[PDB]
Design a protein around this ligand. Structure first.
Ligand code: DX5
Ligand code: DX5
Ligand code: DX5
Ligand code: DX5
Ligand code: DX5
Ligand code: DX5
Ligand code: ZN
Ligand code: ZN
Ligand code: ZN
Ligand code: ZN
Ligand code: ZN
Ligand code: ZN
Lengths: 216, 217, 219, 217, 217, 216
């Protein structure tokens, strides 16, 4: 099924609890949480203890995206913080396969993500292991960036592979997703759509999420 | 020479920074200590510049930002833009602590320098003339609730003495394990700014809990 | 293509390397697989070149050195002098895998290249013409006793296919979770060199234990 | 259009001005400038300020090749130094796509390069935004190295991809390119040829460059 | 006050750690000095915790582990389980030497701190209260058979003085270039624990070779 | 004896040959060469091969200052390039002592330098080993920066130690040294003065170096 995942990176950091409540008013089923350490990407967003704090105020799926170097050192912390899905970059560790096994052994769903410049082939050795494949549609680091349509080719490629192997993991897109681009993402083969800046620039979060469902 | 209390937001409810900041403004505290951690200088990641920027519009207190991150100089503009009033950086986090401090000052913020418990006081000697604040960690950086390290007070006395000899006037701050039973010693050692997280936020009545510190002094 | 067994000393009794090597020599194993770990490429530190140098006098077998260390090129000369016969390095451990392999050959050693489970077989393509051995990890590097990763055999087939297309003849090795129940599958996929640690050394009679692999190979 | 790009790394560093003049005497349209930081490769060559100083002594295309880690931090410096082309390594950053965008956004032509051991696949997601694809024919680091013919396989695969995508970026080769190897580079699909030692070992640069064009036939 | 001899297993026969440990137990040496090198803090890799663990059952002596590795804190648990009795770490190997020492003690082992030849004795002052041993390198870490560095004795003296003034009782160890001709000066400087590698293992009779040190003392 | 060391970092890079010629026309005895790798400091200047080509164009003392991480890997390279003195930062390696021994074993004069923020205590165990101690008077990176007076307190500390130990190494200063600041540097105890922007900003280099000789 098609899932909408509002990115909390675009919300009011001084009131996470009320922002989480606003999201739960919509029909979105996921909350996308961007962890940035200043190493993998230039800036620092927030870490596991912040996620743990958010956990107590939400019943949605915590879709954690780790834009940090050496993510395996945080598997235990995110499991304790209540992360439902942990998505890590093939570019952030020399042992992506083992890192993914670690996530699953910890009881969470395992997600793998690749940057716009990383070839889809970096995903092939991991298909039989992951629960989600995230294709970045903007270069990681911040919200409000321009959608990169070329990345949709990798979405198609992975969807084709999933079929050929008879696998069933979700395919997510993240970056520049809005009412004008989400349709292209769906057609390419994605079923999970992350949206930050677009959704949070509206006061009526419920209607904004609906503009995406309608665009679909 | 005035005594200031700096509640550490790291020990507060992260899901409600706004109300937590409002609680602090109810007390007589003049500073809000903000711990920035990047998973590199210390094991964990707390929050960054954009979170500070969000907090900024819900507080009129002094934003005493403490950067427990590697190569802090790259974040000077970000925190200036975020509304940080003081930027305190670790001598252990860069090979160019002097220039880094100059960058903070030129950016319009007050410059603070901090050293870990294992770092000798002499690491601060070459920086005395350019800082507005010297922070002596009294616990090993990383998290709250750790045991106070008395030996670190020797360094507070040492810096206070250097401040006098050179006739300087920067504030001397302590951070970690600061509570009603340890704050007096910090004061006697020569510190005038006291950061406190766990001891304060574990209490429901913050204004009252902050007063226990004032009284203890 | 000669089928070879390479007991991994990582699973042996570190307090008696000479003795353990003697036990290997009683078997029909042709290689001794030596895992060098530096605490950077993988979490643990095993042993270095000087330890390999000390083991050299107590064995007549092929020293198949596997470097799970960052920037392996800095150790080429050390291992050559320690007596390593094959030096196998990770594509993930250096930005210059091609040059690193050239350096191993220039030092008079056989050059091997290895890729982790999560690394695509294409990482191997530009290196086929220069190596003497291709190692496909069948467990994520780090330690023994791990579960075999079947999907990795897909990469063994792919490389064997490429080797055939280019008319090359390098050995194809597998390492990790190789035992009597998985070794045949490694063979059928295209491998001819099998590294085994925990499965072999958990047995007091190394000779019969190595034979069980030979039998499982059924070839 | 076939272009020759003399590599200044093989020239008299004590006289860049005169060496650049010697190049302008030939019919070479590019000046290949290798930037090395001692990290991506073992040696340090020269940086942006050197290129900036060279700028006014040449009217040719400054084809800058960055053999440094985290090249994005230098985009602005090279743009301001007068670089015409900025070619960066897929192996030098975890965000090659964004780095290329930064280059283009700064007004320079964007080039991407891969080492002999890096598969051509690393290039696929970047074909749309580059003005040049450089296939190293020697392991980066220094001149006089032996040509690696296997790398030409990647020159052909990219040429094919370019054709299949209706794209039109140049394809460059660099390393061990001489009068005996250039023809093969061309037949493989390359149209821009970097040459260091083969050209500068000669006293008559104009004649030496001509031997290369003659070799192309 | 108690003079102890610590043969360094780095100079022994690696292919026979068990028999080498037995040879040591034939002497009156009370410590086995175990050098852990990771190729990062120093150029070479020696052996790790698993090798130490394997050695544990073959010796009843004190395992005096010296970690020449970066970020040693990550190995405290491993060495504790390996049977290490003493864990000595370099101030130059972590930004949090104080907490690192605390972690060693919290794991049930004796905590030691060491400084390279080029590191000033003042780096030890903040740590005098929590250590059980202070190791002063008398050669630059990396390997054995190096030339003794007399100058380092000044730091042994400085620390023996501080121990006196503070009334502490930690051991003072020296390591590197210690033989029958240098051990005396080490002792005079204030050291009581002497690590010896090449000078001891170069002899067939380990029992009498250790005696030459006792007599030299 | 007092020495003047013009910094080639401030010269015209496209004509190193002619620039060195200008320096040789003055009575300056050293040519200060700043090696930057983009790691120790943010920029890259030039390496050992550049120095190598500079060697035959000068009979002066090549005083190479390495603002690079892990300088020991370059000892052999600079010894071959013709460096006469090799000065390294205590903040650039965990083994400053052995690094200095290496420089001497290589047949070069060993020099050690500390950043403005680095305490003089860092030099304490290195005095018996060096031929030169350099105290930065500006934060390393580039020329034209403001002189940092407080650093002279360190020039004085080392001078004092030198005497108490009866050693005879040179004491150099670098950064912000001009006709106005050089006098203080001398009174602080330094005897070797590096100057870049102040010297090269003038067409008559011979007289500019004399303005420093006079100010002394
Ligand atoms: O592109 P928009 O939807 O504004 O931003 C989305 C971001 O929040 C995204 O999740 C983040 O990983 C980008 O680095
Ligand atoms: O007051 P306690 O709970 O000891 O500590 C407070 C922390 O928030 C402290 O400011 C932080 O820098 C520790 O890394
Ligand atoms: O999987 P088993 O055969 O038990 O272990 C084998 C290991 O010793 C293997 O060689 C090593 O490279 C793993 O990092
Ligand atoms: O191989 P030759 O033409 O001599 O040298 C060419 C080099 O100067 C090349 O540009 C450089 O990027 C190699 O690292
Ligand atoms: O006693 P010598 O042979 O000088 O050295 C012995 C070594 O084993 C020493 O303990 C080691 O820490 C040096 O890095
Ligand atoms: O003399 P000024 O222009 O201040 O400085 C000259 C510089 O070239 C200096 O030598 C350099 O080490 C700064 O990093
Ligand atoms: Zn995301
Ligand atoms: Zn703090
Ligand atoms: Zn192996
Ligand atoms: Zn080039
Ligand atoms: Zn030791
Ligand atoms: Zn300099």
């Amino acid at each position: 099924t098609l899932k909408i995942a509002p990115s909390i990176l675009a919300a009011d950091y001084a009131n996470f609890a009320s922002e989480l409540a606003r999201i739960e008013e919509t029909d979105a089923e996921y909350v996308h949480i961007d962890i940035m350490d200043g190493q993998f990407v230039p800036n620092i967003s927030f870490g596991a203890d912040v996620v743990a704090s958010m956990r107590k105020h939400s019943k949605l799926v915590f879709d954690c995206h780790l834009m940090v170097v050496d993510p395996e050192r945080y598997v235990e912390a995110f499991a304790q913080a209540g992360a439902d899905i942990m998505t890590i970059h093939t570019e952030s560790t020399r042992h992506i396969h083992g890192a993914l096994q670690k996530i699953k052994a910890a009881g969470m769903k395992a997600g793998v993500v690749i940057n716009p410049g990383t070839p889809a082939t970096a995903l092939e050795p991991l298909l039989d292991l992951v629960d989600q494949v995230l294709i970045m549609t903007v270069n990681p680091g911040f919200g409000g960036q321009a959608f990169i349509p070329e990345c949709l080719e990798k979405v198609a490629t992975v969807a084709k592979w999933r079929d050929e192997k008879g696998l069933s993991f979700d395919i997510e897109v993240d970056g520049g997703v809005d009412n004008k681009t989400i349709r292209a993402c769906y057609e390419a083969g994605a079923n999970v759509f992350v949206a930050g800046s677009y959704l949070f620039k509206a006061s009526d979060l419920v209607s904004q999420v609906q503009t995406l469902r309608t665009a679909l």
